[PDB]
Structures are given as C-alpha cells and as structure tokens.
Amino acid sequence: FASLIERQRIRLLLALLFGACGTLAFSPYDVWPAAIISLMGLQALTFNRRPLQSAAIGFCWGFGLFGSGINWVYVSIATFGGMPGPVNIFLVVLLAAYLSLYTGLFAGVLSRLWPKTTWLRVAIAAPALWQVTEFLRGWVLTGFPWLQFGYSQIDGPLKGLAPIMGVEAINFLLMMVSGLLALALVKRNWRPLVVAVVLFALPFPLRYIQWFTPQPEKTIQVSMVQGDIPQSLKWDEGQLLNTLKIYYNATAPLMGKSSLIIWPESAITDLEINQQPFLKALDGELRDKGSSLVTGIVDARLNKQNRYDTYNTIITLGKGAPYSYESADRYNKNHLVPFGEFVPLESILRPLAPFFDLPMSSFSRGPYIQPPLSANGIELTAAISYEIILGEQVRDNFRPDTDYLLTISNDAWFGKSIGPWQHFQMARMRALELARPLLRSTNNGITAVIGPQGEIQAMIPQFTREVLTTNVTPTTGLTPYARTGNWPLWVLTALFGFAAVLMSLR
C-alpha cells in the first residue's frame, strides 16, 4: 500500500477524489472541514514530485474541484443554450479544464522553485504562490473567482479574519494551515500539526469583535419580492405585461407599511425608455404613500457618439428619490458575466466559431466606482448578481455613509442546482467583511436578508412566488478591511514571496 502511492497514475486518481471533496464545503453542503481535507490533499500528493509531473497532479486536483463544484453551469447551457448535448458537455468540461490550469500552474511552480518538502514550501511558499495564482484566475479574461476556500468559513472558526483582511486572507490562511497538516502527516512529525493547530485557533476570537454598531431608531421594513417568473432568452412579449402585473399586484399592498421595496434583476423585462408612464405613475403612487422602490431594469442610453449603450441598470423610484431618465440614482453593472452578457474576447472567436451560441448584443459597462443609490433617505451600495462575488469592487464602491448592501440578482437559469447556493454564500460573505446588512433579492433564487456578520436574518423558500417582509437595522462603522482594502494581504504575500524566493536562490 505504501509502494502504490509513489505511482504517478495513482496520484492523479487521488487528486480527483481530494479535489472533489472541496466542493463539499460550500453553501449546499455546509461542511467546512471538507476544505482543509481538499487543500491538504493538494499539497500532499505533490510532495516528492519533479516539476511538470506535479502540475498534472494540480491540474487533476483542480479538474476534480471545478468539475464537481462548477457543474451547475450545464443546467443553464443545456436548458437555454440552443446547442446539442455533446457540445453542452464539452463546454462544461472545457470550463473545468480551463480553471484547472491555475491550480496546475500553482503546483508546477511550487514543486519547481521549492522541490524539497519542508516548512518553507507549505507554510510560506504555498500560500504566497496560491494567492498569486488565485488572482490570475480572477483577473485573466475578466476572471472567474469561483470556488475559493474562504467563503466556506462564512460560519466557521475563521470567519473573524474576514473583517480584518477579507476573504482572500482566509484563502491565504487555510492554505498555510492545511499545508502544515499535510506536512505533519507525510513527515510523521508533531511540530507541523502543533503549529497548524495554534495558527488555526488564533483567528477564532476574531469573530467576537463587532466593528459595526447597530442603529435601532433607523430601521426600515424591506419588502423584497421574489417574482418566480419563468425564464426565457428573449423575455417574450405577452409575458412582459404579466410580470409587470405580478410585481405591481404583489407590491401595492406593501406600499406605506414598507419603507423600501426591492425587485430582482431585470424585474422589468423591457428597455427603460419604453416604459416611462408605468414608472412615472408608479413613482407617484409610491411617493403618495411613503415607500421607495428599487428595481433592476435594462436601459439603452444614447451616447454622445449616437451609439446606444445597453446597460444593466438599477433604477430607484418612490419617496426620497423621484424617478427621471436623467437622474443620478442609477447603478450600471460594471463587471459583466462572461459568455452570458458579453464575449470575453470577440473578433477572434465570434466569426471563427459560430457553432457555439453567443449573445448577439452585449451589455455595456458602467463606471467602476459609483455613488451609493439614494432611496427614501437611505444609501445603498448596489452590486448586480455576479458583482457580489468580487470582494474588491464592492469594497471600492462602499462608502462610510452606506447603510445597506444591495445584491439585485436573478439566478433562475441554473434551476434546482447548487449554483444559486454557492452564489448566495459568496453574497453572504460581503456582509461580514463590510459589516453592513445585505439585501439580496432574486428571481427563483435565495431572496434573503443577511446581517452585518454574514448571518441569515430572514429568508424565503426558493422557486416560489413570495414577498420577504422583514425589519432591517442599518449599521455604522468601518471594518479594517473597508478602511485598508486588499493591499495589507498583498504586502504579506509580497513579503512571503520575497522571503520564499530568496530561500530558493541560495
């Protein structure tokens, strides 16, 4: 049994098993210790492997993590994309394989510069190189920072580290802690595990410090509405009036009683200019009662060059924010979803390979930093769906005078899969590091109110048409992550990178 692990093909098979165990740590399978096992399974099979041989181990580990965690993408591709089954499976495998290069790149470089299995490789070299490769996965071709082992600790021992340096600190720390556990197992030494136990127990008290301050006499009654609208590519024509009637009939009783009313992404499945009387009259009704509505709409502004820019807008109506087509209380989606809203790199792919379905018209991008939306005297930092998994853009748009965090989204393409849950967990992450309540409204998704510590305050069942009426108290105060950002971690990464690379160049 000891003579079988040294085989290369045995290492690859175990990489799939240990890689797949990582997906059992996210929201649908709330098992946080399944991330340490996956990480310690990564930097324990790569031990005593020459370069270009441990990269295959890392690639297979990544293929087992992104091939079993990111597989809900098949639901959206098969159901809506007009492509045959073999092509649909091919794209999911290709996406898993592509995301596995960064894991493969991490292993091929870790075992090249640091071949010997020592504490320098696992405690120092691995977390610094892991953070760099994770950044590259989240930066190349607009990135895809999905399935990061820092969101699994939203309710865990390491949740206190999120307000200090962000989610990436948990990813950095878990790789360091998991590596020492792997070093202890392989080398049969109690020192690596003793250090790992102490290192893992240090951030536990950090979850009992409240950087925020709840404000009792400023609370409102949010009334986020879950449409349960069936999905379509063209959004249909007759169904345009039905969805407007569904939201309006489910909102009119909520007016007056509720201060803020929130609708999901693309709640109005039409261009903003096309429905002016509906919005102007609705704003008048809300203003006369004392409620403000925040809804996601698609607007095609006319640029100074006489070319339309189809933004993904979040308009605000009602009391405290009168609606006007020239108003500044709008949010335009900056980071578009690859292959869903825009082609990451066209003119080399669209004419070359028209067999794969691509969107004929692509959305435009808004400013990177935008002021918080004003709604009935409340400042909200919007983040449309995919933008909530980006911990940097949300922090940059965040301001001290921000009351709530908005996560207008529509994860109805993926059906009953685990994608909506994993997205919900990442959205839940951007409420503990910023210490602001998060108001997430979705269509056929997890419509919930997240507290200032990544805690689910109120929630409604998925795939049903319901309104989530609850009281939310705004919080004040700045976390160390909000005040500084992600640069304190990159200083630590640079210092560890400088220290580790110098040791590899004796």
Residue numbers in the entry: 3 to 508
Wording from the paper:
Lnt is a 57-kDa protein that is present in diderm bacteria. It converts a diacylated BLP (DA-BLP) to a triacylated BLP (TA-BLP) using glycerophospholipids (GPLs) as acyl donors. The reaction is proposed to proceed by a ping-pong mechanism at catalytic triad residues Glu267, Lys335, and Cys387 (Escherichia coli numbering). Lnt is composed of two equally sized domains, a membrane domain (MD) and a nitrilase-like domain (ND).
The M2 state has the second substrate, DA-BLP, in the binding pocket next to the thioacylated cysteine of Lnt ready for step 2. In an attempt to generate a structure representative of M2 by cryo-EM, we initially used the Cys387Ser mutant with the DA-BLP analog, FP2. A 3.0-Å resolution reconstruction was obtained, but in the final map, we found the TA-BLPtide product, FP3, indicating that N-acylation had taken place and that the P2 state had been generated (P2B). The P2 state has Lnt in complex with the final product, TA-BLP. Note that the P2A and P2B structural representatives are remarkably similar. The main difference is at the end of arm 7, where the loop (residues 234 to 236) changes orientation in response to the disparate sequence and position in the binding pocket of the peptide parts of the products. In Pam3CSK4, the peptide sequence is Cys-Ser-Lys-Lys-Lys-Lys, while in FP3, it is Cys-Ser-Ser-Lys(Abz). The three hydrocarbon chains in the two structures superpose essentially over their full length. The TITC alkyl chain aligns perfectly with the amide-linked acyl chain, while the sn-1 and sn-2 chains of the diacylglyceryl in both Pam3CSK4 and FP3 align with MO2 and MO1, respectively.
